[PDB]
Amino acid sequence: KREHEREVIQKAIEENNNFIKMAKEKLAQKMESNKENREAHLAAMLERLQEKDKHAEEVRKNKE
Amino acid sequence: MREIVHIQAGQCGNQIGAKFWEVISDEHGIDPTGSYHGDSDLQLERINVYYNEATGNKYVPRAILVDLEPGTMDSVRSGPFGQIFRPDNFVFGQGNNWAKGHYTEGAELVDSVLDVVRKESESCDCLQGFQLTHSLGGGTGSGMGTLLISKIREEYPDRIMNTFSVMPSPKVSDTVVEPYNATLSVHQLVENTDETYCIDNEALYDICFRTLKLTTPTYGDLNHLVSATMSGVTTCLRFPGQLNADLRKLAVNMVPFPRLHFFMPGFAPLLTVPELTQQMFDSKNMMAACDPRHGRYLTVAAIFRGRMSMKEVDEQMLNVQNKNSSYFVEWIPNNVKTAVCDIPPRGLKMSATFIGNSTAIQELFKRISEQFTAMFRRKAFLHWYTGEGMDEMEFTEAESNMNDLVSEYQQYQDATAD
Amino acid sequence: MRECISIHVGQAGVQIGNACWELYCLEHGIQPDGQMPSDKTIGGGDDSFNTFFSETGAGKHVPRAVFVDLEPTVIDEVRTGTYRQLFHPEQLITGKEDAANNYARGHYTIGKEIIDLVLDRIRKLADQCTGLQGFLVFHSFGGGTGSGFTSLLMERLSVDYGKKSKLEFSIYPAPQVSTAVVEPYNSILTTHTTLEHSDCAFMVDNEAIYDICRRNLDIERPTYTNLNRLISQIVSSITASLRFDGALNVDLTEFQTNLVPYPRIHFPLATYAPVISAEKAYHEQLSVAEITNACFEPANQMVKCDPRHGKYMACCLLYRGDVVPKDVNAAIATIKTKRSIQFVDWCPTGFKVGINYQPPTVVPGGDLAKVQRAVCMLSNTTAIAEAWARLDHKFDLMYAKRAFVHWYVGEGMEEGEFSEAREDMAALEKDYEEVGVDSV
Ligand SMILES: Nc1nc2c(ncn2[C@@H]2O[C@H](COP(=O)(O)OP(=O)(O)OP(=O)(O)O)[C@@H](O)[C@H]2O)c(=O)[nH]1
Ligand SMILES: Nc1nc2c(ncn2[C@@H]2O[C@H](COP(=O)(O)OP(=O)(O)O)[C@@H](O)[C@H]2O)c(=O)[nH]1
Ligand SMILES: COc1ccc(N(C)c2nc(Cl)nc3sccc23)cc1
Ligand SMILES: [Ca+2]
Ligand SMILES: [Mg+2]
């Protein structure tokens, strides 16, 4: 029975720790995934804007 | 403080810009010298949204004045309140051609404008974004305004870009190249603004002639409508109330899809609370010359200004939606929202301003598409644009994107919940 | 010991927090400067009110509270308001750019820039506690901060404070006073993300509170102040067993044991009585039998749903004022005969009763009559799932067209966070159905 008592309390510690680990890892992957996505969207906005600068150089060149 | 930076471009931009600053300065108790002489402190709670603070408790509008033709600011400085504007925020050149404003003359001047934009922006606690007044039918406000948007957006990709865009009508101006200039501006607005108020000269004329009985309406009479509307649609940005709004909250709640961001403003009266409500949804009170019963409302924002029973406004706004339920898309629950502010505009004891994202706006764009193709097949006046280096593909694409926007507005007019 | 730290998030949570702490100060005789002349224990003590207030050496009683908003406007009114001296400035935390009604900005874009500072401020409070029981989080479902920052915070609190108790007062959206068309999206996202991190959550439907002010207080068009004063009475009723002493006093965590049969089923329905105007309370005293009866009238619920067409898994009565067990037992006995109170087959039908003798307080200038006795019922009924159904429906109408989804995607979110959140809510509605089916 003593052996069983300290396995119960070890199990409680092990669940509580695993719950803390999973939460900590979950939001670390969530925040990292969120930064990549937002940066991909801002980078795409700039890539298209920077293309409008290229097209305006060409338009001035076609004038010559 | 959540600062808005105001930019006015071209002839039309600066005229309605000044009038906007005249009306809100008067509403906030700012005189032409920047001094506060007001009654309520609701006038100064959020005054920093639009005004900069200066020594001697001077309030200076956070405004940048731009035009490729000098003289237009001359009238501004000599106009009423012309000395309230910061003099370094005047930027001027020395021709009704979109390409020259966007690609040739406007490019020469655009950096000096951005320098002034930077100076005002860098002195902000937290920049909401920008607000541009311009016409779509001329050369500076249309071509250079849209270039300024592209360059500002490149440098501030995370701030809101908002414009008041004046649409050309053959009923006000005869310049034949307006449908070209307007279509080219719309091509930029669809891609690069978050919100655009369609201030339609055709609706402004039809209002002045038919409703106000002005047989020969001037730009003065047209722009009196424009300042009343601009005062209305900004009410919840400038005053404290139950819903404290900013440009991003306006965008998020009004724009269900990125490209469907062109708003029909309405104003009333052009009264009893049920009458205001009924008139505000009336096609004759719209500044966009579109019948709302020819389309569906994606979203609506309403501002009631003046002293009135807010219980009565709550019932009437619910009443109009129930009796007109078919004209509000069913797949956006609770898509009508109403705000109330106590200060009315000058001369009115109570007013209602209306901001609609309606698929009936396609009528506005269809009108210009027709005026555009009437010329484009004829290749008429194209040399004014190809001469500046433009290629035909651009004209086709701008036309083709504007035609896509109408289909999309038609796509959601037709969607259903089940 | 047994301290509780209150965390007030976004406009709704901050302003409701103002109403509650003002009420708490009135109930305990704490002045706007924090002085409490009846506390003879200067600088400390293990009194009941000490679960919610710490004491400084100079005799000031300071709320165990942190206020957080992603913009300064609302918390600036606390900093300049009638109770400014009550709070140490470090308890009032504000960013510069709010969430703009966008969960993604509250959870990710703006929220991540201030979460560490917030958790440090909470840590400074936990460290002043001899035995911390847990946290009470106040927030709206609908706002960008209340939804997005709250769920980011609840996630972080689970990491930093193990399985320490986390309780919520969550403001459910109503069209009468809502501020954004995207409130259904933010509600589902935050409900999904928080469900595993919250032990017990009291939903307050703004339409119910709004109807009660109109029907029972004759307020034509209720403001936030009208709603919050009534909401703070309900919050006061729930926390009163932690803040006051009593022989007949039953600890909230003893009610919690009965209210939560399965971790996910943790949303009690609160009903509060009597809500009556001064004009109508005059020469009309409501008995224990009358106020207990009012708890089974659906128009007095903090959430609109119909318990008569659902099943009970628990029923708790929290009384405050001039009440004795003899009257309560009499009232319950007649109610059980005359009312539709059906329990699921797997749970006992008794009613857990708690009585606190300190009678209810009213804020000067309010609309609520001061009364001799009041009651808050906390019941676990399957009917509360109707509130989830209404919201999940509103979410479905917009999400099928992907309306407004581009504002969340532009901040870094993915469509699968939407679908994942909606499925969890679907499973939650299914959970409430399963617990109400009879055993085999
Ligand atoms: N009962 C009550 N509800 C409120 C109050 N203030 C806001 N709400 C509710 O909160 C919802 C919107 O969430 P808010 O808390 O206002 O937004 P927020 O927390 O400031 O987050 P942001 O969107 O970033 O500003 C609305 O639907 C309101 O019904 C209040 O003072 N009392
Ligand atoms: N409604 C309105 N439209 C205007 C006003 N001024 C110009 N427009 C329109 O703008 C178009 C010409 O643009 P314009 O102002 O000349 O551009 P700019 O000369 O480059 O600044 C015409 O089609 C007019 O209809 C005005 O004050 N009110
Ligand atoms: C779609 O539902 C909506 C529409 C608009 C808003 N907000 C942020 C507003 N913003 C501004 Cl500037 N003015 C006004 S007037 C009434 C609302 C309102 C909120 C919800
Ligand atoms: Ca003490
Ligand atoms: Mg806010």
What is the gist of this entry?
The PDB classes it as structural protein. The structure is cut from a larger assembly and holds chains A (64 residues), B (418 residues) and C (440 residues). Chain A has 64 residues and is mostly helical.
What does this molecule look like?
This is part of a larger assembly, with chains A (64 residues), B (418 residues) and C (440 residues). Chain A is mainly alpha-helical. Chain A has one domain: Methane Monooxygenase Hydroxylase, Chain G, domain 1 (Helix non-globular), CATH 6.10.280. Helices cover 97% and strands 0% of the residues of chain A. Chain A is built from one helix and no strands. Chain A has one helix spanning 2-63. Chain A is rod-shaped, with a radius of gyration of 28 Å. Chain A starts with a helix and ends with a helix. With 418 residues, chain B is α/β, with parallel strands linked by helices. Helix content of chain B is 44%, strand content 19%. Chain B contains 14 helices and twelve strands. Chain B has helices spanning 10-28, 72-78, 98-122, 140-155, 178-192, 201-211, 219-233, 235-238, 247-254, 273-280, 310-323, 362-376, 383-386, 392-414; strands at 3-9, 51-54, 58-61, 63-67, 90-92, 127-135, 160-167, 195-200, 262-268, 297-306, 336-341, 350-358. In chain B, the strands form two sheets. Chain B has a ten-stranded mixed β-sheet. In chain B, strands 2-3 form a two-stranded antiparallel ribbon. In chain B, strand 2 (51-54) and strand 3 (58-61) form a beta hairpin. Helices cover 41% and strands 17% of the residues of chain C. The relative contact order of chain C is 0.12. Chain C has a six-stranded parallel β-sheet, sandwiched between helices. In chain C, strands 9-12-10-11 form a four-stranded mixed β-sheet. In chain C, helix 5 runs parallel beside helix 6 (183-194) and helix 7 packs across helix 8 (224-243). Chain C has three domains: 1-268, Tubulin/FtsZ, GTPase domain (Rossmann fold), CATH 3.40.50; 269-383, 2-Layer Sandwich (60s Ribosomal Protein L30, Chain: A); 384-437, Helix Hairpins. Chains in contact: A-B, A-C, B-C. The B-C interface holds B 2, 125-126, 242-244, 246, 248-249, 251-253, 255-258, 299, 309-311, 314, 330-335, 337, 412, 415, 417 and C 71, 73, 96-97, 100-102, 175-182, 184, 220-221, 223-224, 394, 397-398, 400-404, 406-407.
